[PDB]
DNA sequence: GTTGCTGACTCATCAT
DNA sequence: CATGATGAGTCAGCAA
């Protein structure tokens, strides 16, 4: 059946579907809005449906970025531990080469 | 009445001692209010541990980052000296073979 | 029935 | 006004 937002919109004789109110690009939304004669109650409901529809996408995107950022940090730690080990190994071979050259030269 | 802190730390049994003069719906609403304050703490505690884990990961990363950069800088600075010494070392061996 | 989590939505801000 | 990011709070639904 009709969601609460759809019922509210039709109760105020809003001609647009809710999917259109939320997902229309800003440019098409403004031009469509400019061809109508809405009163204050109708305008406020349209904006409320669009704002909430867009913000809940922003909220779930923000939660997913937190999880992804943790994976990146753990990947960063994994690579840094490998880089430190690689540099320690390189420093070790260079240390052994320099020690022997100084030893052969007494 | 009761404050937010007094209610959230109250056990279920201790809440049964604060029902003097309350309706059946008032008791249900008081317990539901306690559950809401509990959920506010669960959410805040859930966010504290996520921030704690993130700041701890970023602390180890920054420590290893400056550790790796110092290692890479000192290794390059020393490789230059080893190449110069080896270059002069091979020139002496080459000169010795002339003799 | 309660507890502890957590995804989802909403409001209130901050920024462009 | 439009837009998006984000902490705090709220509710719903889950497993224990």
Numbering used by the authors:
A (entry chain B): 453 to 558
B (entry chain A): 23 to 121
Sentences copied from the publication:
Nuclear factor erythroid 2-like factor (Nrf2/NFE2L2) is a member of the CNC family and plays a central role in cellular defense mechanisms against oxidative and electrophilic stresses. Stabilized Nrf2 then translocates to the nucleus and forms heterodimers with sMaf proteins, thereby functioning as a transcriptional activator and upregulating the target genes involved in anti-stress responses. In this study, we report the crystal structures of Nrf2/NFE2L2, a CNC family protein regulating anti-stress transcriptional responses, in a complex with MafG and CsMBE. The co-crystal structures of Nrf2–MafG-CsMBE complexes show that the CNC motif stabilizes the conformation of Arg residues in the basic region in contact with DNA phosphates.
We solved the crystal structures of the heterodimer between the DNA-binding domains of human Nrf2 (residues 452–560) and MafG (residues 21–123) in complexes with two kinds of DNA fragments containing CsMBE (CsMBE1: 5′-ATGATGAGTCAGCAA-3′ and CsMBE2: 5′-ACAGTGACTCAGCAG-3′, where CsMBE elements are underlined) at 2.3 and 2.6 Å resolutions, respectively. As the CsMBE1-containing complex was solved at a higher resolution, we mainly discuss this complex here, unless otherwise noted. The DNA-binding domain of Nrf2 contains the N-terminal three short α-helices (α1–α3), followed by a large one (α4). The CNC motif (residues 456–498) constitutes the first three helices and a part of α4. Furthermore, α4 contains the basic region (residues 499–518) and the leucine zipper (residues 519–560), which mediate the interactions with DNA and MafG, respectively. Three Nrf2 residues (Asn507, Ala510, and Ala511) recognized the central TRE half site (positions 5–7, 5′-TGA-3′) in a manner similar to that of AP-1 proteins. The N-terminal side of the basic region of Nrf2 has three basic residues that contact DNA phosphates (Arg499, Arg502 and Arg504). Notably, Arg499 of Nrf2 contacts the DNA phosphates up to four nucleotides upstream of the core TRE segment, while no other bZIP protein binds the DNA phosphate at the same position. In the crystal structure, the N7 atom of dA4, which is unique to purine bases, is recognized by Nrf2 Asn507 via water-mediated hydrogen bonds. The bridging water molecule is clearly visible in the electron density map of the CsMBE1 complex structure.
